[PDB]
From a paper:
Pituitary adenylate cyclase 1 Receptor (PAC1R), which belongs to class B of the GPCR family, was identified in 1994 as the receptor for the peptide hormone Pituitary Adenylate Cyclase Activating Polypeptide (PACAP). PACAP and its receptor PAC1R have been implicated to play important roles in several cellular processes, including regulation of circadian rhythm, control of food intake, glucose metabolism, learning and memory, neuronal ontogenesis, apoptosis, and immune system regulation. As a member of Class B GPCR, PAC1R uses a “two-domain” mechanism for hormone binding and activation. Its ECD is the major hormone binding site that determines specificity and affinity through the binding to the C-terminal portion of peptide hormones.
The overall crystal structure of PAC1R is very similar to other previously elucidated ECD structures of CRFR1, CRFR2, GLP1R, GIP1R and PTH1R. The three conserved disulphide bonds hold the core of the PAC1R polypeptide together in a sandwich like configuration. The orientation of the loop between β3 and β4 relative to α-helix 2 is constrained by the third disulphide bridge between Cys77 and Cys113. The sequentially invariant amino acids, among the class B GPCR ECDs (apart from the disulphide bonded cysteins), Asp59, Trp64, Pro78, Gly101 and Trp102, are placed in the structural core of PAC1R. Although the side chain of Asp59 bends towards the β-turn, it is still able to make a salt bridge with Arg95. Furthermore, an interesting feature is that the bond between Phe106 and Pro107 is in the cis conformation. More importantly, Lys20′ makes a salt bridge with Glu104 of the ECD, which is the same conserved residue in CRFR1 that requires the positively charge residues (R35′) in CRF and urocortin 1 for the binding to the receptor.
Author numbering: -346 to 119
Write the structure that this text describes.
Amino acid sequence: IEEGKLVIWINGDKGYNGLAEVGKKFEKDTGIKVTVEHPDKLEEKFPQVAATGDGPDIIFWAHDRFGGYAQSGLLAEITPDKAFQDKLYPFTWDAVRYNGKLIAYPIAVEALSLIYNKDLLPNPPKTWEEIPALDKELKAKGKSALMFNLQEPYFTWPLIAADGGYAFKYENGKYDIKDVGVDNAGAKAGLTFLVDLIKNKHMNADTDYSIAEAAFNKGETAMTINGPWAWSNIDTSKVNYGVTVLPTFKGQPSKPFVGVLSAGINAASPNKELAKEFLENYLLTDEGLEAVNKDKPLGAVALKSYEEELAKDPRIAATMENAQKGEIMPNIPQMSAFWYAVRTAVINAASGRQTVDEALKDAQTNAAAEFAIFKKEQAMCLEKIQRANELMGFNDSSPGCPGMWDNITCWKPAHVGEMVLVSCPELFRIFNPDQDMGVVSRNCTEDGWSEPFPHYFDACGFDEYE
Ligand SMILES: OC[C@H]1O[C@H](O[C@H]2[C@H](O)[C@@H](O)[C@@H](O)O[C@@H]2CO)[C@H](O)[C@@H](O)[C@@H]1O
């Protein structure tokens, strides 16, 4: 944003108040102010606003998004000295290395665990297969066995990958974009098992993060699946909780993705030197990380000295046990297509819009082949919005709802009270050869843009011509 000031974005689930405390120490010593914000959907927001030169100076996200940011050139190469590099674990530096260059500072290693209420379930299940019978028993006490976020595929991935699902195949040191493991026997069985839990009313398809959290933290469900950041709210709730290895599926460990929370510096920030100093000399210290960790736990931190200090925490131990059974996320630019593909597949199979076999058949192609469409359409969208904003100027107009790219298609700026129609985008043709007949709308209201009507898959994904 502005010279002589640091703006930082970080997810609203993380220790942002803790990070702001490090910010306050920074400005006390340097005179240079630090504002920490937690925009919704910042990982997508970032490439849009950072592409126009207006991001934060620093963005925090798991490392999987950073190769895409790097490729788009939205990230400054970082310059830590040999002394500093030695203070963090090699494995965490690898997570932020892209085409041979370091593109962010690693902060902490995250993996999902099984979090369970010890009073409801003193001996938690070792197997996913045991869960339906546990739920039946608990429901007779007005309690349920398990609730977790079903809207974000990050949370369902451990079960999909358990019996052999994978994202991109890694062989001979590189990811093969064409070899996507979301549609093999293991992945199918995993997603089928999830869909059966919903069918049998052990879970509801619409369950999201805040719903699952609220249910666990009020003592209503015996288990959830969540990361280290969630432990602080559970502490506040006084639930007697344990954090443990995820259940097995078909005898195999669940295989969560491992993320390294990382901090990248905007390539357009004028304050790259200030950004460096904050990250290297304030945040990545025992004291900086303690401040953040005490707000919302980070997991296993990248800084060796502090990771050693924390290592006996049994909840971190469980985290590390689940991470060892899991796999590091790729950081390749195509991970954005992978996550689109699998989120679509899980939401569709869970809601009955597609069968599991069709959902996954399509996701395998979409993970491999959709990124180029996304990139083309995103770039065309930014151009259309620029043109539209210019014409609003020429017409003495102002946008009721701003022009935006929503990862699927382009919405021109609109007046309050105006509906906008767009053609179904080419993206949906894999589902529907007649997607070119489809139309999707949004309404520009006093409360901003409405959600798409119909929902995108309903509008665009079912072949409407037999
Ligand atoms: O569900 C897809 C989503 O998964 C990961 O995001 C995680 C993030 O890594 C965690 O730190 C925590 O914030 O929860 C997120 C899931 O809601 C990937 O990092 C992300 O790029 C992907 O879209």
